[PDB]
Design a protein around this nucleic acid. Structure first.
Ligand SMILES: [Zn+2]
Ligand SMILES: [Zn+2]
Ligand SMILES: [Zn+2]
Ligand SMILES: [Zn+2]
Lengths: 73, 96
DNA sequence: TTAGGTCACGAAGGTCAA
DNA sequence: TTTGACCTTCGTGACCTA
């Protein structure tokens, strides 16, 4: 179970169980130091279906659920 | 030998001695590969994490350095030579 | 006694078809 | 230009023979 979007979990990654999606999105995010801006209240609901709704809140949750940046290379 | 079955690297349960120090079956495997491969670990932190049965795999550089401080010796690691050799003599003596 | 050999598992990387 | 299902490496360690 992915502590981020919920969808199936390939297994832990950068410190947290997570789907393949939330893995790539978190890698790409770091390796490129991308920065997103929240379209609304910054507490958007993140799940399998609407995990792409807001990049800011997605990534943000990743950190929140404990994903480490230095775990990425 | 009667000395506590506790690994001096990670506090895990030790299965005895390995390359001259009381260690878990995991740190043994580690310490050897490390030397045989001549690896160069470098600790992100300030070179001083605490090795534990659970975090160990976190910072290799420190694990290794720790292996080394509790006395593990490379001396005890068979060369590539030694091995091939024995492996052979024994194998030939399979001659039936 | 411990040594090396196994090898089934992570967990990091990467590829590219949509 | 992002996704994410899939695939590639390789370090791990529990077990085992000797
Ligand atoms: Zn997810
Ligand atoms: Zn948002
Ligand atoms: Zn140990
Ligand atoms: Zn360290």
């Amino acid at each position: 179970i992915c502590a981020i979007c919920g969808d199936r979990s390939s297994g832990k990654h950068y410190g947290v169980y997570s789907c393949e999606g939330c893995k790539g999105f978190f890698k790409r995010t770091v390796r490129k130091d991308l920065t997103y801006t929240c379209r609304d209240n910054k507490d958007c609901l993140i799940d399998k279906r609407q995990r792409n709704r807001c990049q800011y809140c997605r990534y943000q949750k990743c950190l929140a659920m404990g994903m480490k940046r230095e775990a990425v290379q | 030998r009667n000395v506590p079955r506790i690994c001096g690297v990670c506090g895990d349960r030790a299965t005895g001695f390995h390359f001259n120090a009381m260690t878990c079956e995991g740190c043994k495997g580690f310490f050897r590969r490390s030397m045989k491969r001549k690896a160069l670990f470098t600790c992100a932190a300030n070179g001083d994490c605490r090795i534990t049965k659970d975090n160990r795999r976190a910072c290799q550089a420190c694990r290794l350095k720790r292996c080394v401080d509790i006395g593990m010796m490379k001396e005890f690691i068979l060369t590539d030579e030694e091995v091939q050799r024995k492996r052979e003599m024994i194998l030939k003596r399979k001659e039936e």
